[PDB]
Design an enzyme around this catalytic site. Structure first.
Site, PDB file in Angstrom:
ATOM      1  N   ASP A 104       0.855  -1.180   0.000  1.00 34.93           N
ATOM      2  CA  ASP A 104       0.000   0.000   0.000  1.00 34.93           C
ATOM      3  C   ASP A 104       0.889   1.227   0.000  1.00 34.93           C
ATOM      4  OD1 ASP A 104      -2.372  -1.570   0.201  1.00 34.93           O
ATOM      5  OD2 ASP A 104      -1.899  -1.972   2.297  1.00 34.93           O
ATOM      6  N   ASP A 133      -2.638  -1.387  -5.106  1.00 41.21           N
ATOM      7  CA  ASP A 133      -3.487  -1.879  -4.035  1.00 41.21           C
ATOM      8  C   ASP A 133      -4.173  -0.741  -3.275  1.00 41.21           C
ATOM      9  OD1 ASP A 133      -4.746  -3.983  -2.724  1.00 41.21           O
ATOM     10  OD2 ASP A 133      -3.181  -4.034  -1.181  1.00 41.21           O
ATOM     11  N   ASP A 137      -4.238   1.691   4.320  1.00 42.97           N
ATOM     12  CA  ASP A 137      -4.911   0.516   4.876  1.00 42.97           C
ATOM     13  C   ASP A 137      -4.463   0.322   6.316  1.00 42.97           C
ATOM     14  OD1 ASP A 137      -6.158   0.224   2.325  1.00 42.97           O
ATOM     15  OD2 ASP A 137      -4.927  -1.526   1.743  1.00 42.97           O
ATOM     16  N   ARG A 190     -13.997   1.660  -1.102  1.00 39.53           N
ATOM     17  CA  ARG A 190     -13.280   1.606   0.198  1.00 39.53           C
ATOM     18  C   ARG A 190     -12.892   3.021   0.636  1.00 39.53           C
ATOM     19  NH1 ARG A 190      -8.922  -3.332  -0.514  1.00 39.53           N
ATOM     20  NH2 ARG A 190     -10.345  -4.818  -1.444  1.00 39.53           N
TER      21      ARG A 190
HETATM   22 CA   LIG Z   1      -3.739  -3.333   1.161  1.00 42.61          CA
END
Ligand SMILES: [Ca+2]
Ligand SMILES: *[C@H]1O[C@H](CO)[C@@H](O)[C@H](O)[C@@H]1O
Ligand SMILES: *[C@H]1O[C@H](CO)[C@@H](O)[C@H](O)[C@@H]1O
Ligand SMILES: *[C@H]1O[C@H](CO)[C@@H](O)[C@H](O)[C@@H]1O
Ligand SMILES: *[C@H]1O[C@H](CO)[C@@H](O)[C@H](O)[C@@H]1O
Ligand SMILES: *[C@H]1O[C@H](CO)[C@@H](O)[C@H](O)[C@@H]1O
Ligand SMILES: *[C@H]1O[C@H](CO)[C@@H](O)[C@H](O)[C@@H]1O
Length: 298
Positions: A104, A133, A137, A190
């Site tokens: 990430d 990605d 996160d 997301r």
């Molecule tokens: Ca990730």
């Protein structure tokens, strides 16, 4: 702004607070080799990033670090991986186009007391959905994280809190995250997606969200307030794609073309363990657009 400012916003200001490298020496780095050596070192350290650093890398950031961008600095292809550490500040950093193999842009895993402030995180929508990605996160039992004044843009899967439905033992009761004063633009999904955690979103401006904004899942409690959804999907706040539903509480929202279909939760104004300053929904765009992102002057 000052290199040694400590976190004064949200959950990362609780449970001991977040001071990064305060108390340590200060170094300025302008090459990938300098940067990874500084960030992966042991002990308190303030790291000032100068110029454009390009290269495909995953940096194993250690505890007690402040990583601050100068105006005009950026990382291209280099992701920051914050794993089994504590007390990290990432501030005024622009990070872009981190390939999936390098993780990430900012990945926070099994870590506590982390402040991401005035960052600018992006990739593109032209390389496929899994070419990159995440931007930001937060997983595997992390706790006490604040994402403030940050611009997340031009990216498919932006911010994942809690990586899988089967992770209750590790994640239940953890994953307390604040999203304060952020700008999300041209992101597909997301924004954030939350399993298990407790998430407070306030003063956020959402623009051109493609598929879903906030997804609350597996018993998560999200509170969204003083926030604007502009020209975005109907899926503004939802609870989908998991084995147990999550919950949301809302206040002072400008909905635009978006809606809330998530079940009503319990996370009220009186249940937040820090002080916060709400702008009011009609003032959010003016106070956030042009402020969120890499806009600080040191
Ligand atoms: Ca990730
Ligand atoms: C942040 O803290 C440093 C010392 O850690 C000071 O030198 C600076 O003035 C600021 O208060
Ligand atoms: C390194 O120098 C910086 C100033 O750039 C300080 O803020 C820090 O405390 C350290 O002494
Ligand atoms: C600050 O110190 C770092 C290493 O921690 C060096 O890479 C840099 O060149 C400066 O000396
Ligand atoms: C590293 O050097 C830069 C300038 O090149 C400073 O801004 C920084 O505080 C540190 O001394
Ligand atoms: C980037 O800038 C740093 C600090 O000025 C240097 O140490 C490096 O050689 C590169 O020019
Ligand atoms: C940090 O990681 C970088 C990756 O390129 C190395 O070049 C550096 O020596 C340090 O190990």
């Amino acid at each position: 702004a000052s290199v040694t400012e400590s976190c004064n916003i949200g959950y990362a200001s609780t449970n001991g607070g977040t001071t990064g490298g305060k108390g340590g020496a200060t170094t300025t780095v302008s090459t990938l080799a300098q940067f990874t050596k500084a960030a992966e070192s042991s002990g308190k350290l303030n790291i000032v990033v100068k110029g454009k650093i390009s290269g495909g890398a995953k940096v194993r950031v250690q505890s007690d670090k402040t990583i601050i961008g100068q105006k005009g600095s950026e990382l291209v292809g280099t992701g920051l991986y914050i794993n089994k550490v504590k007390n990290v500040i990432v501030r005024n950093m622009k990070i872009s186009k981190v390939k999936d193999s390098n993780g990430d842009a900012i990945g926070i895993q099994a870590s506590k007391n982390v402040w991401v402030d005035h960052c600018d995180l992006s990739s593109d929508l032209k390389s496929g959905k899994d070419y990159y990605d995440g931007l930001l996160d937060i997983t595997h039992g992390s706790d006490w994280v604040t994402v403030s004044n940050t611009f997340l843009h031009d990216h498919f899967k932006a911010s994942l809190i809690g990586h899988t439905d089967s992770n209750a033992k590790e994640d239940k009761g953890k994953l307390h995250v604040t999203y304060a004063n952020n700008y999300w633009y041209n992101v597909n999904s997301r924004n954030p997606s939350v399993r298990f955690g407790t998430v407070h979103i306030y003063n956020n401006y959402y623009l051109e969200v493609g598929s879903s904004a906030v997804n609350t899942r597996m018993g998560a409690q999200v509170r969204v307030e003083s926030t604007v959804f502009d020209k975005s999907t109907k899926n503004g706040i939802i609870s989908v794609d998991s084995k147990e539903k999550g919950y949301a509480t809302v206040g002072d929202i400008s909905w635009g073309s978006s809606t809330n279909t998530a079940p009503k939760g319990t996370l009220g104004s009186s249940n937040i363990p820090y002080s916060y300053n709400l702008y009011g929904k009609n003032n959010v765009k003016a106070r956030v657009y042009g402020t969120a992102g890499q806009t600080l002057g040191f």
